[PDB]
């Protein structure tokens, strides 16, 4: 149904691929084929975003962290405590 825009081109005039109706072998009562099983009960695994913690403030730049501003470890009072 996703492919490359199968149903996107639905303005197409007269003759078309797909299955408007009475088109047995397109998975309707057909795809069931080999009996699969559901089980699971919980779907997708609970993947956690490794990025977390945060809490405190990153250690005074110069070791990691993007964006931001402050100073190139200038002699300014900031220097170490640049924050």
């Amino acid at each position: 149904i996703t492919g490359e825009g199968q149903s996107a081109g639905n303005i197409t005039g007269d003759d078309w691929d797909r299955g408007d109706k009475v088109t047995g072998t397109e998975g309707v009562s057909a795809r069931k084929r080999n009996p699969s099983r559901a089980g699971f009960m919980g779907a997708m695994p609970p993947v956690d975003n490794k990025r977390n913690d945060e809490t405190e403030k990153p250690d005074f730049l110069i070791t990691g962290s993007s964006g931001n501003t402050r100073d190139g470890q200038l002699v300014t009072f900031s220097g170490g405590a640049r924050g």
């Binding site: 003759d15 078309w16 691929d17 797909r18 408007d20 109706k21 009475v22 088109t23 047995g24 072998t25």
Partner: protein, 90 residues
């Protein structure tokens, strides 16, 4: 030859031949069978390319149901098996 199979079954052959006309008017499909099931059921087999057969069956299911008693049973077969060919006139 395109192995894609279209077949349409109707009560009475007036809708069957309407379906066959939709076949031979829509796409590159050749009717490979016109058979009488028994007790009035008449059905038609055409063969051709997958998209061609799909479009033809679409046209038949658009123009067949309201003709007399009308369509009773249609479908498409995409990639028919080799062993089915004996049942298709061999």
């Amino acid at each position: 030859m395109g192995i894609a199979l279209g077949m349409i079954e109707t009560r009475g052959l007036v809708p069957a031949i309407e379906a066959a006309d939709a076949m031979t008017k829509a796409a590159e499909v050749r009717l490979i069978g016109r058979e009488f099931v028994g007790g009035g059921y008449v059905t038609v087999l055409v063969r051709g390319e997958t998209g061609a057969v799909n479009a033809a069956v679409r046209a038949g299911a658009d123009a067949c149901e309201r003709v007399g008693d009308g369509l009773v049973a249609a479908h498409i077969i995409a990639r028919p098996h080799r062993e089915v060919e004996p049942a298709l006139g061999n």
